[PDB]
Amino acid sequence: GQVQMKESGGGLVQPGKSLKLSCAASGFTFSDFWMSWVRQPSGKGLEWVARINTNGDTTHYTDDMKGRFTISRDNAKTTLYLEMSPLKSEDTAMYYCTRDRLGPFDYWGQGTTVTVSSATTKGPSVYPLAPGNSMVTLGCLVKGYFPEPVTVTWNSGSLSSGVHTFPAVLQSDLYTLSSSVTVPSSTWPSQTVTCNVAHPASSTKVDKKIVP
Amino acid sequence: TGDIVMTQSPAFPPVSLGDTVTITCQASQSVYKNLAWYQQKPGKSPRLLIFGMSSLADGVPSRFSASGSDKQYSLKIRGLQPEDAAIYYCQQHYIAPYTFGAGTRLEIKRTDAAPTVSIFPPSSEQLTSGGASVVCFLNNFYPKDINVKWKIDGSERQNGVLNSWTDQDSKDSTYSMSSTLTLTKDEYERHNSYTCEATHKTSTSPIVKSFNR
Amino acid sequence: TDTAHGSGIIPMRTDLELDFSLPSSASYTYRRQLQNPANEQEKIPFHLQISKQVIHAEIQHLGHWMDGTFNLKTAFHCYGSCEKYAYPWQTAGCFIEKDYEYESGWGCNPPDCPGVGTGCTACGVYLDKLKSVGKAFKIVSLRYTRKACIQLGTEQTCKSVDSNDCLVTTSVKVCLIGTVSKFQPSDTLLFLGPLEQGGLIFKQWCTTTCQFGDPGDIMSTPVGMKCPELNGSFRKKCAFATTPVCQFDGNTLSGYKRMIATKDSFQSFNVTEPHISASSLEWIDPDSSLRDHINVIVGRDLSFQDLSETPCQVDLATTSIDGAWGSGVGFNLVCSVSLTECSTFLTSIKACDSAMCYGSTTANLLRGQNTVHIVGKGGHSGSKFMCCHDTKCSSTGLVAAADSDKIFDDGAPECGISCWFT
Ligand SMILES: *[C@@H]1O[C@H](CO)[C@@H](O)[C@H](O)[C@H]1NC(C)=O
């Protein structure tokens, strides 16, 4: 019924190593559409990368990546793949698997981040922010992590209203961001407000209860 | 390269809510009908809006429309809403390579709102790391032009501060800002009071929120 | 026994460039003999075979077009409100209701209900007899492909040339650059019956604001029914001491009825060899309403020495004939072509006589015996038709007693007036 596509296989690789990205599609006939990969840098325009036909005998690439990228598909499992040769620092972007209609792309996935740097993974640190009325606000600080991204939720994600996740700032190979939530004064500290932070690369999962 | 260039004009002035807006997309060559419009909300993935230069994509509200003459196309929106305030792209698919555009971001014009300021002292868990970080939140204000300033015992401090800004909200069309003054424990134990001031056009008098140690 | 029925000999002093405008349902056959400018007796064959146009259209399944019948009913109540009771039209497939809530005066009132501002007059327009009449698709993108084969000396190469691809070899290059098309994106193709019967083309197919009577008003989408609104307004016609009836002065005929009424005002099209999937619709247009621009270029560095060692020998013999030599009846000739010293060789055989050649047939011969049929129209009473290659023909021929969407261009000099009415 519904069309759903999810990317996976991204992260951090060294400048000169290989990496293969995967993308699982469901909800439509995977063996009847042309597939394509489209990446986008941090705050830049979209850039078409590759394209594959139904069976796999015709593959279109860009004049830049001459034999560096290799797109493939598996119709038995309805999966799309993108194998990459030793990468460079100019390939750091977020890759989307799209349903190419010989031209426009009518469906886009979530997208995975691919980072090509010579840095090492670093574990984050979650710090609660206690007040120091009418509508109280609380904070949750995630300091010193690498690389992007992270996931911040409140009470298993059932606090979407009044939430504010702020863009991180890069400080010499170390990111850090903060989240802000607003709840009525009758709920806190009457109820336990929990901040959930997740970091995929470092396999970090921290749940902190905000207390005065 | 001998590819077609899709000139998309950025920096569009803000428009009021509920009115009619029109974005243009110029082409270096006539592609005649092979034009698609996309929408990329802040943080989310792109979304196909219009294909074939006149055909609405599935799941797109009826208040969207597109047309255009030779190498000069437009995208019209009637009855603006706070949701569809994002970046829009145009793609041609007449001849290879199928190139994209630059991107045009909208901005809903609302009434001026006062920022909800708040300050937070460093936590006990952060003190174990050896450093201190004071957080000052400024949520739900308009417009985006705002200034922040830190005071340590009345003295001005404009170094070691890291601040970031959020895009326009898709629910109330407001902005937000988070500033963080990072110091060490050796310096944090020397002073007593810390103040976070803010200057916005909603009031010439700067709002003040401080705390003692 | 050979006869001067050769192909066009072209000296290769300069490069050979060609531009073609192939019709939609047309197959071209261009063949010559490239001559070495350093030796008159050194010639190599050059064959160019281009197939028909294959139209690939990524489409969007709009669903089924439904046809219904207009119906109007009226419901009156003395007390209460219009949003209190139910009506038989509210449970139909498509229905639009306009009610005059609390508008009960006295001039429109029946003999019963001596009240004012307390009744309810509801009017319901519904559609019944909903039956599918055709299938609709919306064009998202277009693609045109043609399969081309070249034969130069002893080399043979084939490829499916797209718009973003070219058949490029060491000496020949075939590109597909432009395509004049009758179809373009954002068009709506409607098939009333099966695919092979063709369909119609609609540009203003309603999508957002559909009204009863427009092309695409009632649609059977896979998600569910998509009912349109009406083109008109309601009114309450009433008399003294009578129940108020409801009138609707608007459009009554459905969208399918008006389409059948003015069907001649829409664009029609045919399809041949159709292939439809969940995402595409491939077919060959037989109306010859599309033109493809093909550029062919052969360099003059052919290296006539390499393409001369062990050429393709071809022997043939006429073995059967069937038909008449009359201009309109036609005859069928059977040739036994024997290809030697080559695995595969692309050429064409012609059915010629002492003077002219009334037919041709292109075939990719294999090493050994090959049976080739040639259709021809024309000839005279004493015309002894024979099978013929470039120059060599069969030893004997046969005599008779008492379009095809192919194009042949071999550059042969046709007979003048001496072969007309003889
Ligand atoms: C489709 O084929 C029929 C066969 O008689 C022909 O009359 C008609 O003109 C064709 N359609 C078009 C658009 O040429």
Residue numbers in the entry:
A (entry chain H): 0 to 131, 137 to 216
B (entry chain L): -1 to 211
C (entry chain A): 668 to 1069, 1082 to 1101
Would you copy out the relevant sentences from the publication that reported this structure?
Entry of a hantavirus into a host cell is negotiated by two membrane-anchored glycoproteins, Gn and Gc, which form a lattice decorating the lipid bilayer envelope of the mature virion. The Gc adopts a three-domain (domains I−III) class II fusion protein architecture and is postulated to associate closely with the Gn, linking adjacent Gn tetramers. Endosomal escape is mediated by the Gc in a process that involves engagement of the target membrane by the Gc-encoded fusion loop, followed by upward ‘zippering action’ conformational rearrangements of the transmembrane-anchored Gc domain III, which bring together host and viral membranes. Here we structurally characterize the epitope of mAb P-4G2, a potently neutralizing antibody derived following experimental infection of bank voles with Puumala virus (PUUV), a hantavirus responsible for one of the most frequently occurring hantaviral diseases, a mild form of HFRS known as nephropathia epidemica (NE).
To ascertain the molecular basis for P-4G2-mediated recognition of PUUV, we determined the crystal structure of the PUUV Gc ectodomain in complex with the antigen-binding fragment (Fab) of P-4G2 to 3.50 Å resolution. Consistent with previous studies of hantaviral Gc glycoproteins, PUUV Gc assumes a class II fusion glycoprotein architecture composed of three domains (domains I−III), with domain I and domain II forming an elongated structure and domain III forming inter-domain contacts at the side of domain I. Fab P-4G2 recognizes a protein-specific epitope at the junction of domain I and domain II of PUUV Gc, distal from the hydrophobic fusion loop at the tip of domain II. The epitope comprises ~830 Å2 of buried surface area and all complementarity-determining region (CDR) loops participate in the interaction. Arg100 (CDRH3) is the most centrally located paratope residue, and is predicted to form multiple hydrogen bonds and a putative salt bridge with Gc residue Glu725 and across the antibody−antigen interface. Site-directed mutagenesis of Arg100 to Ala considerably reduced the potency of P-4G2 to neutralize PUUV. One Fab P-4G2−PUUV Gc complex was observed in the crystallographic asymmetric unit, and there was no evidence for the formation of higher-order Gc dimers or trimers, such as those observed in pre- and post-fusion class II fusion glycoprotein structures. Consistent with the hypothesis that mAb P-4G2 targets a pre-fusion conformation of PUUV Gc representative of that displayed on the native virion surface, structure overlay analysis reveals that PUUV Gc from the Gc–P-4G2 complex (PUUV GcGc–P-4G2) is highly similar to the recently reported pre-fusion state of Andes virus (ANDV) Gc, and is distinct from the known PUUV Gc post-fusion structure.
